[PDB]
Amino acid sequence: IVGGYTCGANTVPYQVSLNSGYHFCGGSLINSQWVVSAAHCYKSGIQVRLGEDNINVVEGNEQFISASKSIVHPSYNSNTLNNDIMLIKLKSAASLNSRVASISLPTSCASAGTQCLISGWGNTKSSGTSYPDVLKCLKAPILSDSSCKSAYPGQITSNMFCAGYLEGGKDSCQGDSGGPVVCSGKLQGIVSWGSGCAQKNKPGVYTKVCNYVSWIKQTIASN
Ligand SMILES: NC(=[NH2+])c1ccc2[nH]c(-c3cc(F)ccc3[O-])nc2c1
Ligand SMILES: [Ca+2]
């Protein structure tokens, strides 16, 4: 997260860290046994780490659970990143409490101008790499579809939306992929891609979760 602030320990209780010997992507807990992340974060050997603040220190509240299976959307296109969503089923259910809690799926899509919270342990520098130990937060608005298509002509599909600042300086970045974009208490986006990080007129692009709620529900119901 570039231009963000320290969230504060366990203030984003649905945030998870996907780990394979190091943090490589974020994710969101949607119920005690499932996590939603980005399809491009897929790899085998994933351990889901819940209740984290400093990912390099066991401070208490952490729950490390192995993934039993990861389900990448069947129509995920790795060249366009269209349908960049994946569901991860945990080997055992997590113990939910005030520090580890799930976030709700939306019933309607969010409008331009909606203010959202983006969080993650990704790079905090736009020019270079500085990875934080604790969770960073960023408040950012959803941009109109015309400004998003004007910024990335021919690369935005109806399953994506832009959020951020066209002046540059505040954005999600590498290491934040798969993490949450929460607006009014509902999970509206998944950190997916962008051109560099916090560059002027190049806002971040997010997977539009409201287009996948029936898919998520039907997939969880059958697995
Ligand atoms: N500017 C952004 N809003 C952004 C967000 C997530 C990213 N994730 C990545 C990324 C880069 C890699 F080289 C490998 C995996 C990633 O998720 N770049 C990203 C850029
Ligand atoms: Ca920790």
Q: Are residues 59 and 110 in the same domain?
A: no
The experimental method is X-ray
59 annotated ligand binder: no
**Nearest CA, atom 18, ligand 1:** 174
Q: Are residues 146 and 183 in the same domain?
A: yes
Residue 152: Cβ-neighbour burial (10 angstroms; 0-12, 13-18, 19+):
middle
User: Same domain for 79 and 90?
Assistant: yes
Separation of CA 131 and ligand 2 centre (Å) = 15
Type and span of the H or E element at 145? helix 145-151
121 in the same domain as 94: no
From the DSSP assignment, how many helices (H) and strands (E) are in the chain? 2, 13
Q: CB-based contacts of 170: which residues, under 8 Å, 6+ apart? A: 2, 3, 4, 138, 140, 164, 198
* 123 and 184 both lie in a single domain: yes
Tell whether residue 145 is among the known ligand binding residues.
Answer: no
* Domain co-membership, 152 together with 178: yes
- CB of 197 within 6 A of ligand 1: the answer is yes
Cα–chain-centroid distance for residue 47?
16
How far does the centroid of ligand 2 lie from the alpha carbon of residue 49, in Å? 9
Task: Find the 222 Cα to ligand 1 centroid distance in Å.
Answer: 31
123 and 191 housed in the same domain: yes
- Of the candidates 187, 201, 188, 123, the one whose C-alpha atom is nearest the C-alpha of residue 161 is 188
Query: What CATH number does residue 66 fall under?
Result: 2.40.10.10
Catalytic site positions:
40, 84, 177
Annotated binding residue 75: no
> Quick one: resolution in A?
1.4
Mutate to test the pocket of ligand 1, among 119, 161, 177 (most ligand atoms within 8 A of CB): 177
The pair of structure tokens assigned to 179 is: 């993490």
* 57 and 117 share one domain: no
The radius of gyration of the chain's CA atoms, rounded to the nearest angstrom, is 16
Ligand whose nearest atom lies closest to the CA of 38: 1
Co-location of 22 and 97 in the same domain: yes
- The domain containing residue 111 runs over which residues? 1-12+103-210
> Which ligand has the minimum distance to the alpha carbon of residue 163?
1
